[PDB]
């Protein structure tokens, strides 16, 4: 009777903490293993791969786009994806945005992250990048829904990422429910056969 939850919890066991040192000054900001830039690129590609899973249901193909919660559709049909990567609009190149010299970096994904976790609905991070914080589904991503293992409200210290793909409930529509469940089986098969030594992944699909 409520939305269906497909979910991943991702950790980076072989990755160390690192230190963001802001420019021109500012105090050091620690960043947990899974907010390493290379880990975030890997996770974005896993997320996109999930977005492009297709299941076979009799003579139809079922995509996530067919079954996902797209509350702003038909005008914005982007699937709702609650993920830290949506602060970068699920874009490798936004994630790599940086303002810097040959010696110094004035703004980068650290800056954007630190701003967005406090202003998730903002269209402009007020920094030299001027990047939006809104996810590509047109809505905000609250930091406590997509990060775990941090202390207080220091989301930069997160030790796990939470990625959620809401799917329609299809209450009183068993036919479409069949397609959603076929896609969920394919989701499970994919993730259970995805082994990346730099990542641990807990994964669940709706019962």
Author numbering: 401 to 607
What is written in the article reporting this PDB entry?
The goal was to co-crystallize NPC1-C in complex with primed A82V Ebola virus glycoprotein (GP) as part of an effort to explore the basis of the enhanced infectivity of the A82V variant in the 2013–2016 Ebola outbreak in West Africa. Human NPC1-C (residues 371–621) was expressed as a C-terminally polyhistidine-tagged fusion protein in E. coli as insoluble inclusion bodies. After denaturation with urea and a nickel-affinity chromatography step, the protein was refolded at pH 8 using the glutathione redox system to facilitate correct disulfide-bond formation. Although the objective was to obtain a crystal of a protein complex of NPC1-C with the primed and glycosylated form of A82V EBOV GP, the proteins did not co-crystallize regardless of the glycosylation state of NPC1-C, with nonglycosylated NPC1-C crystallizing alone. The two disulfide bonds that were expected in the structure, i.e. Cys468–Cys479 and Cys516–Cys533, are clearly resolved in the electron density, indicating that the refolding protocol was effective. In full-length NPC1, domains C and I fold into similar structures, intertwine with each other through an extensive interface and form a tunnel that may function as a path for cholesterol transfer. It is likely that the absence of domain I allowed NPC1-C to crystallize as dimers using the same domain I packing interface. The overall structure of NPC1-C is similar to other published structures of NPC1, as expected, with root-mean-square deviations on all common Cα atoms for each aligned pair ranging from 0.36 to 0.78 Å. NPC1-C uses these loops to engage with its binding partners, explaining the different configurations.
